[PDB]
Nucleic acid binder design. Structure first.
Lengths: 46, 39, 293, 49
RNA sequence: CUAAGAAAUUCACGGCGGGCUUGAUGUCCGCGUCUACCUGGUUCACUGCCGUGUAGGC
């Protein structure tokens, strides 16, 4: 179980640093939301 | 190609997500629908 | 230590769809064969529900069960949070039982606030509440709904008796089912205001009716402990106490008087004031809802 | 037509819209089953082999 | 200031012919999805002493 939450976390950190408009900061709760989204879709494999 | 030795829609999604959350039109359900769509 | 990921509170003070029927004043006693009002359509085109022309009085009727054991959630994820919540509601009722909340629910059943729009233009409203013991009338009330105010809570013998009966039902000492029937003098051929659906008014079997959740919203307007300026009055107990028709949200979470901050202070670290916000959080879990992570 | 009565996923600063605004309703369609207004008891019938 | 500097490929065709894939089969067992909601901030409406005469009437 080490991989999915960490992959979702680092994916949402990549999406944090990649998507930052004139609304400059994106933040950590949005990071946790997209992290758990990809984490559900990665633990759906088994 | 050699046997001895030799040697972008994701960016479109990221660009339209950034250009989508740049502007706001009344901040309703369809905005969150398109955000969930793009993510 | 923490809150559960899922938390579900089932509904107490369970109402029914208020069936409406026209009739005449001074015939409220033998008001059993009264014909139910129906919805008609007229000129894109809309719906409208009036009375028959030989009827000057509306009568709504709904049965209200009260359940009891309001501090027991129907779903959790950890046993420790349920034990701490049960301990907090238990020390709430051991400090003071359902005496203020039951009195305000007896007020909201006394003044016919479940008449949502039909009350505001009514000449005289009388509410009759029958406590159905087995299948018959055990205790019957007859409340002047207009003499009892909407923003002030009086003191009365019969109203405190109804408050004690709702308190006995809310503590769990008895089964309480109440036939609540309200006679409102509106006028000959006037318009009633049932709950509107997704303009199509709501009906069951050729009979216009108010939704159950609108009646449950109307008898829940008891919240008078919130940082507003004096002049609003009682609002319904929603978490993040909202008036979406007015577009405002009292107890917004930047002020520390919402349901969730008062709950996670009153349970997880034992922090709430003496009488007011405890009554607010207990009435909010009487309403029920979905809480969690 | 309910109210937004749930946990908010983030604080006051929200660039990308996650949670709905509290000063805004929410519309739902639910399934409900009631007895008729003249029938006051429920009968549940099933067979067991 | 280029292994520089230049260069018409151009014509045609008969792939034909024949065929048995066969048989047989046991998916088989369980299951709590719960919980609470105001469609309301809107129906610019039948007339008529009216003026069809863009203001005028309950």
């Amino acid at each position: 179980g080490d991989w999915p939450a960490e992959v979702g976390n680092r994916f949402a950190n990549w999406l944090n640093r990649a998507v930052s408009s004139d609304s400059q900061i994106l933040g950590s709760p949005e990071a946790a939301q997209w992290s758990q989204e990809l984490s559900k879709e990665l633990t759906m494999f088994k | 190609q050699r046997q001895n030795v030799n040697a972008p829609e994701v960016s479109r999604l990221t660009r339209t997500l950034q250009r989508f959350l740049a502007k706001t039109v009344h901040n309703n359900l369809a905005i969150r629908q398109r955000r969930a769509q793009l993510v | 230590l923490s809150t559960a990921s899922v938390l579900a509170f089932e509904r107490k003070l369970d109402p029914s769809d208020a069936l409406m029927s026209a009739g005449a004043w001074a015939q409220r006693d033998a008001s059993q064969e009264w014909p139910a009002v129906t919805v008609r359509e007229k000129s894109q085109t809309v719906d409208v529900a009036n009375l028959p022309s030989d009827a000057d009085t509306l009568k709504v009727r709904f049965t209200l069960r009260v359940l009891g054991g309001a501090g027991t959630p129907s779903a959790c994820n950890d046993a420790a949070y349920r034990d701490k919540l049960l301990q907090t509601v238990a020390t709430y009722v051991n400090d003071q039982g359902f005496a203020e909340l039951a009195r305000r629910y007896a007020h909201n059943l006394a003044n016919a606030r479940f008449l949502w729009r039909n009350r505001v233009g009514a000449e005289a409203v009388e509410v009759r509440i029958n406590h159905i013991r087995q299948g018959e009338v055990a205790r019957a009330w007859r409340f002047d709904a207009l003499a009892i105010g909407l923003r002030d809570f009086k003191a009365d013998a019969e109203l405190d008796a109804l408050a004690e009966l709702i308190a006995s039902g809310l503590s769990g000492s008895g089964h309480v089912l109440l036939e609540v029937v309200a006679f409102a003098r509106i006028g000959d051929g006037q318009e009633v205001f049932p709950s509107q659906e997704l303009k199509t008014l709501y009906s069951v079997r050729d009979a216009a009716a108010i939704h159950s959740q609108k009646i449950g919203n109307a008898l829940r307007t008891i919240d008078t402990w919130y940082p507003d300026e004096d002049g609003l009055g009682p609002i319904a107990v929603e978490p993040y106490g909202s008036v979406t028709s007015q577009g405002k949200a009292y107890r917004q979470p930047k002020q520390k008087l919402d349901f969730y901050t008062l709950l996670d202070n009153w349970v997880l670290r034992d922090e709430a004031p003496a009488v007011e916000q405890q009554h607010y959080v207990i009435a909010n879990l009487i309403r029920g809802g979905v809480f969690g992570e | 037509r309910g109210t937004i009565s749930n946990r908010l996923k983030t604080k006051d600063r929200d660039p990308a819209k996650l949670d709905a605004s509290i000063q805004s309703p929410n519309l739902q369609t639910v399934d409900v089953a009631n007895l008729p207004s003249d029938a006051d008891t429920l009968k549940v019938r099933f067979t067991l082999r």
